[PDB]
Design a binder for this molecule. Sequence first.
Ligand SMILES: OC[C@H]1O[C@H](O[C@H]2[C@H](O)[C@@H](O)[C@@H](O)O[C@@H]2CO)[C@H](O)[C@@H](O)[C@@H]1O
Length: 400
Amino acid sequence: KIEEGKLVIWINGDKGYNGLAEVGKKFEKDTGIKVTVEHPDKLEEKFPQVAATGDGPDIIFWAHDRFGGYAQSGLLAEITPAAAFQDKLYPFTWDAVRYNGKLIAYPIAVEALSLIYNKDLLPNPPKTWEEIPALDKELKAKGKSALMFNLQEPYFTWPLIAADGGYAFKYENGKYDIKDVGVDNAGAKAGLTFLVDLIKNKHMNADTDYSIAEAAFNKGETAMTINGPWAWSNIDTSKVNYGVTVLPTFKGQPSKPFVGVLSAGINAASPNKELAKEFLENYLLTDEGLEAVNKDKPLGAVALKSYEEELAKDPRIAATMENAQKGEIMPNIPQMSAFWYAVRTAVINAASGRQTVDAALAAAQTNAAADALKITVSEMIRDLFGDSDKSRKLLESINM
Ligand SMILES: OC[C@H]1O[C@H](O[C@H]2[C@H](O)[C@@H](O)[C@@H](O)O[C@@H]2CO)[C@H](O)[C@@H](O)[C@@H]1O
């Protein structure tokens, strides 16, 4: 089901796959081992689906936030770098791929959203979200708009929602409290309420997705977008005079992007775990490998110490780091997917006017907390009963 003697790799359509294939070709040339790169859709859902029955890729690339849930499902192999190699990467990056004492992936890069603006339309960019509406009024009269960014994917809206108090799970004394969810606080209400208002005041469209925001920005139709470093190269092709900067503050407080570490995990069912380790350690995570991917779509602020000191001088990276320190490193816990489904439903509903901000978040709060708990209970019931019918038929029930 996974061919012994070859490497298949999954990484998302927005990332430097053609650049990674290049690294795959170099590997193939020293070791004779063919490396194949693919980007199926809904990768982060497609992976556990197929790997759960022993198929899928030898290697899986996603942000570190999904990996806790994969490791917990027994889907990843433990990764075991020698001290000397661990040393070449930033402590905090290893930390985000650490789950229950075990490293469960290789950290590749630090990804954070920034405000991307067109210097020709908007020479000085807004420092605040509260100035965006007025700005749009003025651009509208020129057949232009202030801002478009993907509203379909809560990853994008979230730094506004967190700005005044939203959070996934509370973090104190080294552990997460999956019973303390921060999606329906007053601050998360204010944040979404502002976003929803921009829609009501027709300063944005509820349908705006990733394609639509990217085409509009890169064609000069809109003065601002919110996007991660992978988007920079398409904008370079456009020749649009752009800057990458700090996100606008809301109610006076910085916007809080969820920070992701692009990680690479080995499929626990892979019969090429040794080849997979050599490709990631001696080929990808080098000045050579990273630069090959980064040339295709920029990775952000790479894990590897030696190559980050070059990338660090770039103002678009610094903008990334400043956005990143103002935000929070995503949790990697299994209950995270529950937080994301619930918030995806909420933003979508309040934006499309299907529910108010308040009924939207009230339901997101209930649902994230219950799905979170459900994820934990389910694990334990598997520990108590493995797969006696008592096990399957208790799970069946508990989920509804
Ligand atoms: O919005 C839900 C989604 O947010 C994050 O996914 C990001 C990803 O980390 C980035 O690498 C880039 O591809 O944008 C994605 C969303 O469009 C979370 O990592 C992901 O788990 C979550 O479902």
